[PDB]
Ligand binder design. Structure first.
Ligand SMILES: [Zn+2]
Ligand SMILES: [Zn+2]
Lengths: 372, 48, 116, 46, 360, 434
RNA sequence: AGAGAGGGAACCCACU
């Protein structure tokens, strides 16, 4: 965490820009000092001293600033804030010290470390289980209206945004669809930030794949097993009305968490949802349309296999389906939000101090309490 | 709120009116004794 | 133009005729931006003190009086855009009012307040 | 009247005053340890 | 006609918002991004939000873009209703004043000398100071000797004095303050402030009669009360209907031999019974004393409440006799006979005779 | 918590070797809170870029350059879940990836490859959070842990031959839970590599030792397989509660509720795993000559008869430390705490207790007997209305916790984070077993 | 011989 992930968080935050002559701030290189207390002079704070005086065994965190107003100026080793250190780390004082040296510091060699000293209290970050991200799972909501529901808690590594689960469900209604025409089961997808059950074929058309043959190529990889094609036939025949990418994206934008104004600004919202909300692990870029289409086809194909039983259903308690958030991922998840809040406060300060016509004071821009 | 002060298992009706803290009560560990009758309990001196 | 807009919040005064709100510097340097030709307070501070108000309630940034219902209710539709006062406390002396009436300008009070 | 404290890491002793910031004279160590009491202690050897 | 829309603003900075919007309108009135709104209203006493006059909400949103003080009303706007648009511009409205700012806020100040320059006036005040003793407060008299003793920023001119931020006092502060920094209308000090420098009271349940009109000599009990023309509803004797009477027609009449209290004057706080009801002199005897108290009929009310009118403690001892001999302890409790000893060795406090104890 | 379902709480099959099966809190959090096994290790995760470069180096076809006709006759390959492309020959690709992992050329040891054989898939996981455990590698029904490895491993601190050198030797490797679904795991080599009426004869990995499936608290149980599993769980609960020397520097630490023991002993009946938890260096408990006998009737229903003379000889006689912290607060002059000995005539609201135990600074000198409702910290806070008479600052003092007694062990005086004076008092009370 | 006590809320770990 403190060796790579903090730098990843700092670099993955966009350089904030303010429009008047424009100026942008960027943070590039971070510095992590040794734990030190102070009013007072900088002195190395031994962890037992931090425990006895109810101090916090935290190391200061510096970073370099580069602002371009363009007129660029750099600011090396600006104090961001203090982050706690768990004992026996690579950035604790007593790393690699011999047992005699530890006994000189009133610290025993028997202590395994791995705990933080916060206000003199020893804290342990309990590892938290979670469902494994970026992995397709097929479950059975036997009480709902869906026969088999697929999901993929997609979360791109080193991305400040959290996970966004997409569901690819199949309406059950084993017999009729409560109609005089609705024969087969229809596959329907729950996208992030979209409140209605979007059909699969609508999404595939919205990805720039107009032909039914191409969508079936991306979904069913063999054209010599007519049973799976027959099973996917009703879902394909739900949305033969919508044939254009424009109309498909318009239907995507209809009934969103943020509803569209008109044909305009709703095509862009649907494009934004398909670009940056569903499946971030397959990429977030303009050329990532076909990769996202391939992965959605894989999700639909696995759902079809589950509906056939050719592959068994997935277990929520199998420990190959779980991850263990240790101190690293947990502190990274905390630091994402707190670093973003520090950036927001800096932006507020800059907005206050550009409208007066003056130049902001960057040491007062970065407040250290919000990050420590 | 007042409704939250009354509605709970920690409110006024269960928590304070039904089951309330009482004076003249002691709580300590029990250890066996076969040398006293079935209707006798051996209480400590500091409790008595 | 920007010449009509006051520069700061200190010593804001509203005109007694058209309820024009300006600083004392702008009244001293420009007079009235609507009817100084009928008042002639430019080049005279005492004329400003006699023809402007020290007590006003509410301000209106009248930007387009030609299509404003507020300008219809405040009777400032035929004027120029600027900062106007809703309620004005004060009154011109009888000499100024009589001189305006001799020039065909009857003095309608801008004191549209509901006094009890 | 002054109280004698043992200066933590220094292991030396020094006087202290009321409303006196807690500092050692050798290296300014912040942790003081109060000396053992002067009144008698008696322990039943049970 | 355009409509008014509420836009939330920074508190205390609404006039500056209107000034900035006017400057922005004039600065972009010839460009390709015009402000299509019609007017901006920031009232004198409405604090928190301003008004934008426009035919559309989108015009308001596109006009307030770039204004940070209105960022809390940027996403959504609320229109003032059509019937309520005139309420926006509707405005309602040797003496004594009360200061607006400072530590003397809303304190009674006697206007000593009105300076004809119309900038400030001299005010007589009672100092709310601690005489430079606590700060490194209620109203009390100005003590010049105390401020000469404590020192600091103080200058003496006999009874005249200057102190602690150019505060001018004499014998009682006499300092200049601005007319706009005081309220010269609506103070109305009391009698205690006169020493420092009609009325209607009808209550429900009281008995009143009618002194004039066609409904004269009708005694009834009070139901409700109002300010000046009460339109009372008295429950008269032998009348099931409720009539109407203002305050000038009624009078606090009371039958002889009832609970009476005094509301104001010299006789307030005392209760008792009245004896004989004259034209206006009503004589009564108190619940405390039997002295004659003569009151006006208006200074009476009907209220049925009753009138108010050891040495061994903490001493290290040593058990020198008995089973516990040789134990060192501290005496917790002690009596004439026995004493409880907190044993230093065991986790137990036991009581022994004082004859068995020997102090260290 | 408080869910009536059981599937999130049960001991699933994939908890083998990664998490202890016995240790769990047996309250309303059964199965939810777990304890990690001994050799289990959570993969800290690395970047997938070297793996993608290696795959592009070999004949792996990316998704943006394929026909959708040759997909079903080949194996779909995933990295961290994202589908990176296709490969035609799954064998000699898994062999190549494993050969690189048995050498640490490109792929880190924590990274895991899983070849789904029934359905044509091959997924490589490089996530941070996966839970793996080291296993031996069985090439031929033969182990790769030869005698020379043991010879170089006994002579540590001389050859500098560590565990990481054995990982680099391609003898042991970390297998996670996904990969356990596609591995044939030998329990012990003395039984499952010798020819018999053959069971499978296709082993890939061998368990190092079965005792490493247990946690830290289930490893201190002698003969845990002879017990019943609820008994093992209850002992796992109790073993984190036994008095003992919890740390070596306990005389410096100002811990609250420090339970230490007079004469702790190592168990006569021990496991091999206690040598690695260092339970023989900071033990918790005493070896006792027990007798399982019906007697007078005081060991009736889960109770035990003890020996008074043995207890008088220091048997389980523990010592209980409790610390008390208090600092004063410099504030806006209305209330001002300060450490001083309060006086009856001066202070107000002073509770009736002994204040002569205090020193001149309002604190107890170490080595002074105190009991219930005895003052330990003399602190007085000022009263704003002392002038607004003759009665001044009120007592705000921390007493010794009632129904407790003992000697004050040591007192430390220092400054806090805010720079205010701050005192800790550790009070010592020995606890004879009654 | 001068005699009473207050905090309060929140959240963790166990105990039967
Ligand atoms: Zn004018
Ligand atoms: Zn020293």
């Amino acid at each position: 965490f403190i060796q790579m992930s903090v730098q990843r968080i700092v670099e993955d935050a966009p350089p904030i820009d303010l429009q008047p002559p424009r100026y942008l701030l960027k943070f590039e290189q971070i510095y992590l000092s040794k734990p030190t207390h102070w009013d007072g002079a900088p002195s190395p704070m031994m962890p037992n001293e931090a425990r006895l005086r109810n101090l916090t065994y935290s190391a200061p965190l510096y970073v370099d600033i580069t602002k371009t107003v363009q007129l660029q100026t750099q600011h090396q080793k600006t104090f961001i804030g203090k982050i706690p250190i768990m004992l026996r780390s690579t950035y604790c004082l007593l790393n690699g010290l011999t047992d005699r040296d530890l006994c000189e510091l009133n610290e025993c060699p028997l202590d395994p470390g791995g705990y933080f000293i916060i206000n003199g209290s020893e804290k342990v970050l309990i590892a938290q289980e979670k469902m494994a991200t970026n992995t397709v799972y097929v479950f059975a909501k036997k009480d709902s209206k869906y026969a088999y529901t697929g999901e993929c808690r997609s979360c791109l590594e080193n991305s400040s945004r959290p996970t966004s689960t997409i569901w690819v469900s199949m309406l059950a209604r084993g017999g009729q669809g409560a109609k005089k025409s609705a024969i087969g089961q229809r596959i329907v997808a729950t996208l992030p930030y979209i409140k209605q059950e979007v059909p699969i074929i609508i999404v595939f058309r919205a990805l720039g794949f107009v032909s039914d043959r191409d969508i079936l190529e991306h979904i069913i990889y063999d054209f010599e097993d007519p049973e799976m094609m027959e099973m996917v036939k009703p879902s394909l025949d739900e949305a033969f009305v919508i044939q254009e990418q424009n109309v498909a994206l318009n239907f995507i934008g209809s009934r969103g968490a943020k509803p569209g104004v008109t044909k305009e600004k709703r095509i862009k919202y649907a494009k934004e949802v398909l670009q940056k909300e569903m499946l971030p692990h397959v990429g977030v870029s303009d050329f990532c349309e076909t990769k996202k289409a391939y992965f959605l086809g894989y999700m639909v194909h696995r759902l079809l296999l589950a509906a056939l039983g050719r592959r068994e259903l997935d277990d929520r308690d199998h420990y190959g389906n779980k991850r263990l958030d240790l101190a690293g991922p947990l502190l990274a998840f905390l630091f994402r939000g707190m670093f973003k809040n520090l950036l927001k406060e800096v932006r507020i300060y800059a907005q206050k101090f550009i409208d007066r016509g003056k130049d902001f004071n960057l040491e007062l821009a970065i407040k250290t309490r919000i990050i420590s | 709120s007042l409704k939250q002060r009354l509605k709970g298992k920690e409110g006024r009706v269960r928590g304070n009116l039904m089951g309330k803290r009482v004076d003249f009560s002691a709580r300590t560990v029990i250890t066996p004794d076969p040398n006293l009758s079935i209707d006798q309990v051996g209480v400590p001196r500091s409790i008595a | 133009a920007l010449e009509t807009v006051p520069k700061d919040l200190r010593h804001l005064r509203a005109c007694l005729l058209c309820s024009l709100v300006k600083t004392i510097d702008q009244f001293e340097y420009d007079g009235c931006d609507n009817c100084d030709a009928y008042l002639q307070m430019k080049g005279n501070r005492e004329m400003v003190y006699d023809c402007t108000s020290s007590s006003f309630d509410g301000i209106i940034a009248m930007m387009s009086p030609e299509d404003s219902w507020v300008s219809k209710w405040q009777r400032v539709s035929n004027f120029k855009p600027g900062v106007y006062a809703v309620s004005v406390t004060g009154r011109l002396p009888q000499g100024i009012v009589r001189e305006l009436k001799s020039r065909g300008v009857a003095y309608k009070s801008r004191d549209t307040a509901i006094k009890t | 009247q002054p109280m004698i404290y043992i200066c933590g890491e220094c292991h030396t002793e020094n006087e202290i005053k009321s409303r006196d910031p807690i500092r050692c004279r050798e290296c300014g160590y912040r942790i003081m340890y109060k000396k053992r009491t002067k009144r008698l202690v008696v322990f039943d050897a049970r | 006609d355009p409509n008014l829309w509420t836009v939330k603003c920074k508190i205390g900075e609404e006039r500056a918002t209107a000034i900035s919007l006017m400057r922005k309108f004039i600065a972009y009135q010839f460009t390709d991004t015009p402000l299509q709104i019609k007017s901006v209203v920031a009232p004198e006493h409405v604090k928190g939000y301003i008004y934008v006059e426009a035919y559309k909400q989108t015009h308001v949103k596109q006009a307030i873009e770039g204004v940070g003080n209105l960022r809390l009303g940027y996403w959504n706007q609320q229109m003032v209703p059509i019937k309520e648009m005139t309420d926006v511009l509707k405005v309602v409205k040797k003496s004594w004043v009360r200061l607006k700012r400072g530590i003397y806020k809303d304190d009674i100040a006697q206007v000593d000398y009105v300076e004809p320059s119309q900038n400030t006036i001299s005010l007589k005040m009672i100092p709310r100071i601690d005489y430079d003793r606590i700060k490194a407060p209620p109203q009390r008299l100005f003590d010049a000797e105390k401020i000469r003793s404590l020192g600091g920023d103080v200058a003496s001119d006999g009874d005249f004095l200057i102190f602690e931020g150019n505060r001018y006092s004499r014998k009682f502060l006499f300092k200049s303050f601005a007319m706009s920094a005081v309220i010269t209308e609506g103070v109305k000090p009391t009698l205690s402030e006169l020493e420092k420098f009609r009325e209607h009271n009808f209550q429900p349940g009281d008995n009143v009669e009618v002194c004039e009109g066609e409904l004269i000599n009708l005694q009834g009990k009070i139901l409700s009360v109002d300010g000046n023309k009460i339109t009372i509803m008295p429950k008269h004797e032998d009348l099931k209907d409720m009539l109407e009477f203002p305050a000038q027609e009624l009078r606090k009449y009371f039958k002889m031999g009832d609970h009476v209290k005094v509301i104001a004057g010299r006789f307030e706080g005392d209760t008792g019974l009245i004896v004989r009801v004259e034209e206006n002199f009503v004589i009564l005897f108190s619940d405390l004393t039997m002295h004659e108290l003569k009151v006006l009929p208006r200074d009476l009310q009907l209220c049925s409440e009753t009138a108010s009118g050891n040495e061994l403690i903490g001493q290290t001892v040593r058990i020198s006799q008995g089973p516990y001999k040789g134990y060192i302890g501290v005496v917790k409790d002690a009596t004439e006979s026995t004493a409880r000893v907190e044993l230093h060795s065991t986790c137990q406090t036991i009581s022994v005779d004082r004859q068995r104890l020997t102090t260290v | 918590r408080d869910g009536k379902l059981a599937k999130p709480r049960q001991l699933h099959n994939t908890l083998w070797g990664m998490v202890c099966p016995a240790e769990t809190p047996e309250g309303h959090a059964v199965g939810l809170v777990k304890n990690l096994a001994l050799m289990a290790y959570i993969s800290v995760g690395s970047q997938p870029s070297p793996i993608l470069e290696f795959l592009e180096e070999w004949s792996m076809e990316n998704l943006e350059e394929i026909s959708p006709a040759a997909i079903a006759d080949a194996t779909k390959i995933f990295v961290n879940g994202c589908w990176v492309g296709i490969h035609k020959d799954p064998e000699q690709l898994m062999n190549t990836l494993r050969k690189l992992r048995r050498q640490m050329d490109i792929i880190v040891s924590e990274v895991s490859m899983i070849r789904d054989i029934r359905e044509r898939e091959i997924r490589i996981y490089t996530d941070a959070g996966r839970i793996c455990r080291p296993l031996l590698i069985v090439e031929k029904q033969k182990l790769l842990l030869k005698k020379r490895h043991i010879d170089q491993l006994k002579e540590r601190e001389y050859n500098n031959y560590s565990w990481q050198d054995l990982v680099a030797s391609g003898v042991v490797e970390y297998i996670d839970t996904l990969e356990e679904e596609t591995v044939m795991l030998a329990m012990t080599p003395d039984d499952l590599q010798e020819k018999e009426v053959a069971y499978c004869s296709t082993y890939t990995h061998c368990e190092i030792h079965p005792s490493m499936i247990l946690g830290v608290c289930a490893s201190i149980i002698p003969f845990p397989d002879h017990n019943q599993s609820p008994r093992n769980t209850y002992q796992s609960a109790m073993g984190k509660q036994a008095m003992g020397v919890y740390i070596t520097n306990f005389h410096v630490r100002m811990d609250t509720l420090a339970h230490v023991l007079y004469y702790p002993q190592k168990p006569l009946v021990t496991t091999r795993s206690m040598e690695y938890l260092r339970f023989r260096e900071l033990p918790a408990g005493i070896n006792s000559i027990v007798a399982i006998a019906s007697y007078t009737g005081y060991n009736q229903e889960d109770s035990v008869i003890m020996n008074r003379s043995a207890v008088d000889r220091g048997f389980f006689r523990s010592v209980f430390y409790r610390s008390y912290k208090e600092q004063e607060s410099k504030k806006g002059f209305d209330q001002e705490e300060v450490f001083e000995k309060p006086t009856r005539e001066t202070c107000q609201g002073m509770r009736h207790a002994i204040y002569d135990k205090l020193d001149d600074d309002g604190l107890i000198a170490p080595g002074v007997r105190v009991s219930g409702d005895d003052v330990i910290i003399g602190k007085t806070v000022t009263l704003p209305e002392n002038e607004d008479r003759r009665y001044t600052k009120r007592d705000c003092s921390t007493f010794l916790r009632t129904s407790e007694t003992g000697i004050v062990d040591q007192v430390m005086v220092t400054l806090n984070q805010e720079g205010y004076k701050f005192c800790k008092i550790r009070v010592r009370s020995v606890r004879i077993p009654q």
